[PDB]
Design a protein around this nucleic acid. Structure first.
Ligand code: ZN
Ligand code: ZN
Ligand code: ZN
Length: 798
RNA sequence: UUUUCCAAAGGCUCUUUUCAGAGCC
């Protein structure tokens, strides 16, 4: 009848050792698996981002708080139990750093036997008894989708029952993304709510980030560089500290008068470096002398989303914002093909750049003859050289300035270096936040060029005065602003090629300009409005470069992802009916590694531009299961564990295996910078960092030199030897986003010399693509398990 | 078997002096 005080929100099962109370949500939940693959309590914890667990009053342990004996951390995802060697008393300790920093140092305690408290997405039976299957089915049954809906209702209001899910029927679902449109106003009305939802979600998830009572080195700078170094106390474990964001520094202490300054991040965590560094744009009134009792806060900004909305409305209301043909093509309207009447250069090669192959030459000649061209660039095909050829030819056409944009600043830097290699005059536009960022192409930045602009000397005098003092008078500031605007306008008109980011093209300084040529790059990594921001500038000839098989843009809002916002402009153009021209040759992999992904994801179209003897590293005496094939799959029988964040995964057994193979690789003579570690899960990456940094069997700096990153963090990077840990291994659950073929594509194509795959074939074989992976690897007879020294071919079949 | 937990990004505002003016980073 009436639910007791300790009753599950989802089902209401009442039992002493079956209900767990959450301090964050002030609700009880059952440990029963239910219809879904996960327990109710674990599902509530992961969905509601809670990290506090309170045991029921009656049970094997009674009213207990699961706190680490060393540090007392509340986050249950880090605690683990150790059975005593003398009695049955269990020791609850954090995985790290409490394993080595434990004050108890009990003889019966050992950290090797340590296991996570959460297993198979549910609490262990001895702690919380799993409800009996018959009782857990005879009671009220709730499915996953309505569970998520009820959790959302609880989040938006802490009063919601089962009847609140059906009787109201809120709906208000965002309009789904269409493939074919009819009006620009329709496009704006459809994509406005999605952008607004994304911005709101980002603001909500990023505004709740602050720290208090931190130290600061507080070093100074000659040219007004208030540079502050401080380290996050790692209690919040927030990685949102990023280049270009805004940080407000508040000094509420009594040592100095209260100060509230604004600055930008200049240095994020690095290899063994940490000590995040920020640059303050405020005056000299900052409390330099004080170090402690410093408060910091991150405030979200809406510049990017405002730029997307402005571009959308400009496209909706301005007929000349884009060419008519491009406007009709983007809306899916069926129109006849148009051939651009451009003069074809006799030689397709670029001065100062390597000669293109036949496929690249054909791609260039086809692109130059079409107002709209789509290029599918497989990994390792030298797409940068191709794009350099395109910009070279476009500038040689003399049809005004040529705009280049890319979602990532690294891609922009690579492309601008490539074009500058031809000797062409290029101007790189950087944001104010990125002005202090040091880059190899920073000498080509707009602000640095202005600082080196010697035709007008009073501008330099004002600049150095600003560098040596604070803000000048109002008239002086107005004159300086006018001089800067005039100089940058002259530079931009004089410049032949302007390169920046896709969002950065929305800068007012770049505004009020018309460009007849745009070569949006890496578009497969950007949301459709992000790619659409630069084109409303007056595009007439428009080129996309990217690979849908590589990866897609990352969207955080669940509703936006469901509505189709994750789709890139490249994908929509491809599915519209435009066949993208794809480069057929590449020089990045030894043929053995490149044979499989070409066969699978590129229907056997890629060609190996390098030979086997070319892609062998000298002084590398490492044994292989097949001497001709420098890759293999190592089989591990580990169990996945929930990461500290509560939504990622890790595995200790695979981490130890990775450590062993990396130690062997360094013993083989491979340079430490060549060894890369790739994991799709952030929690696994952090655990590997902790395991390889603090506990180093070999030289600690030796392990330090290698670097670990997420899939798309490493995607823009190319190295010799790569070792992958797929992490996920669950009998009753899925692999997660590992079923996405794009991540498999980038993971297999990230190498140059060798790939070492580590994972559990039994769990991965359920997904058909990974089953094909396993079948191919067994056909090559490189599935190996057991001792590293004594390699044995696995007998498992899939 | 849910949908997955994964990067990158990045200064303007106010006022009817609005054909404009004012102030901030
Ligand atoms: Zn329940
Ligand atoms: Zn909760
Ligand atoms: Zn602890």
């Amino acid at each position: 009848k009436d639910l007791p005080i300790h009753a599950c929100s989802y089902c209401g099962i009442h039992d002493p050792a079956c209900v767990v109370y959450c301090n964050t949500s002030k609700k009880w939940f059952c440990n029963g698996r239910g219809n879904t693959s996960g327990s109710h309590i674990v599902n509530h914890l992961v969905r509601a981002k809670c990290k506090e667990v309170t045991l029921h009053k009656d049970g094997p342990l009674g009213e207990t708080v699961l706190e680490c004996y060393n540090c007392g951390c509340r986050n249950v995802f880090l605690l683990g139990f150790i059975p005593a060697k003398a009695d049955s008393v269990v020791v609850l300790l954090c995985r790290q750093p409490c394993a080595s920093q434990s004050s108890l140092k009990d003889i019966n305690w050992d950290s090797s036997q340590w296991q996570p408290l959460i297993q198979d997405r549910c609490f262990l039976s001895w702690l919380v008894k799993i409800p009996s299957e018959q009782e857990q089915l005879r009671a009220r049954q709730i499915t996953a989708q309505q569970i998520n809906k009820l959790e959302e209702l609880w989040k938006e209001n802490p009063s919601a029952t089962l009847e609140d899910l059906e009787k109201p029927g809120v709906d208000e679902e965002p309009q789904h993304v269409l493939l074919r449109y009819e009006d620009a106003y329709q496009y704006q009305n459809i994509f406005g709510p999605l952008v607004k939802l994304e911005a709101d979600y980002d603001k909500k998830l990023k505004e709740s980030q602050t720290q208090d009572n931190i130290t600061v080195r507080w070093d100074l700078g000659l040219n007004k560089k208030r540079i502050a170094y401080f380290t996050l106390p790692k209690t919040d474990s927030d990685m949102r500290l990023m280049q270009g964001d805004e940080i407000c520094l508040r000094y509420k202490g009594d040592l100095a008068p209260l100060w509230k300054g604004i600055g930008h991040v200049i240095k994020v965590p690095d290899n063994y470096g940490d000590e995040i560094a920020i640059e303050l744009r405020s005056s000299v009134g900052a409390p330099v002398e004080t170090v402690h009792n410093f408060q910091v806060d991150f405030v979200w900004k809406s510049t990017s989303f405002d730029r997307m909305q402005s571009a959308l409305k400009t496209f909706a209301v301005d007929e000349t914002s884009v060419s008519g043909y491009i406007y009709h093509k983007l809306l899916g309207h069926e129109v006849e093909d148009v051939i651009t009447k451009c003069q074809l250069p006799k030689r397709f090669t670029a001065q100062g750049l390597p000669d293109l192959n036949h496929s690249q030459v054909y791609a260039v000649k086809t692109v130059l003859q079409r107002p709209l061209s789509l290029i599918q660039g497989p990994p390792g095909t030298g797409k940068t050289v191709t794009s350099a050829t395109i910009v070279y030819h476009l500038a040689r056409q003399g049809n005004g300035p040529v705009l280049v944009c890319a979602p990532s600043n690294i891609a922009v830097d690579q492309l601008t270096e490539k074009i500058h290699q031809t000797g062409l005059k290029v101007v790189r536009l950087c944001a104010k936040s990125r002005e202090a960022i040091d880059s190899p192409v920073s000498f080509l930045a707009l602000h640095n060029q202005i600082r080196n602009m010697d035709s007008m000397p009073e501008l330099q005098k004002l600049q150095q005065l600003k560098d040596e003092t604070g803000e000048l008078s109002s008239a002086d500031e107005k004159r300086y602003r006018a001089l800067k605007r005039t100089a940058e306008r002259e530079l931009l008109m004089n410049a032949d090629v302007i390169c920046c980011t896709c969002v950065g093209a929305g800068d007012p300084r770049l505004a009020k300009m018309q460009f007849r040529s745009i070569l949006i790059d890496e578009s497969t990594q950007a949301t459709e409005p992000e790619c659409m921001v630069p084109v409303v500038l007056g595009a007439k000839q428009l080129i996309l470069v990217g690979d849908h098989c590589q990866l897609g843009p990352v969207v955080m809002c669940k509703k936006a992802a469901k509505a189709g916002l994750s789709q890139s402009l490249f994908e929509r153009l491809v599915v519209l009916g435009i066949r993208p021209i794809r480069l057929q040759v590449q020089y990045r992999m030894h043929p053995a590694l490149s044979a499989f992904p070409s066969n699978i994801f590129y229907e056997g179209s890629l060609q190996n531009g390098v030979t086997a003897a070319d892609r062998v590293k000298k002084g590398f005496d490492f044994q292989w299961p097949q001497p001709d094939k420098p890759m293999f799959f190592y089989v591990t029988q580990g169990q996945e564990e929930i990461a500290s964040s509560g939504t990622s995964y890790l595995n200790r057994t695979e981490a130890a295996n990775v450590e062993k193979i990396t130690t062997k690789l360094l013993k083989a003579g491979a340079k430490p910078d060549q060894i890369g570690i790739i994991t799709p899960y952030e929690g696994q990456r952090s655990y590997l960092v902790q395991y390889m940094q603090f506990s180093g069997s070999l030289h600690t700096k030796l392990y330090q030199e290698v670097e670990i990153a997420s899939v798309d963090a490493f995607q823009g990077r190319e190295k010799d030897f790569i070792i992958l840990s797929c992490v996920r291994a669950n009998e009753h659950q899925g692999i997660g986003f590992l079923n996405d073929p794009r991540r498999l594509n980038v993971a297999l194509t990230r190498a140059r010399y060798g790939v070492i795959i580590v994972g559990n074939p039994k769990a991965l074989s359920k997904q058909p693509l990974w089953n094909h992976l396993l079948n191919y690897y067994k056909e090559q007879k490189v599935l190996v398990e057991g001792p590293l020294n004594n390699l044995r071919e696995s007998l498992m079949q899939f």
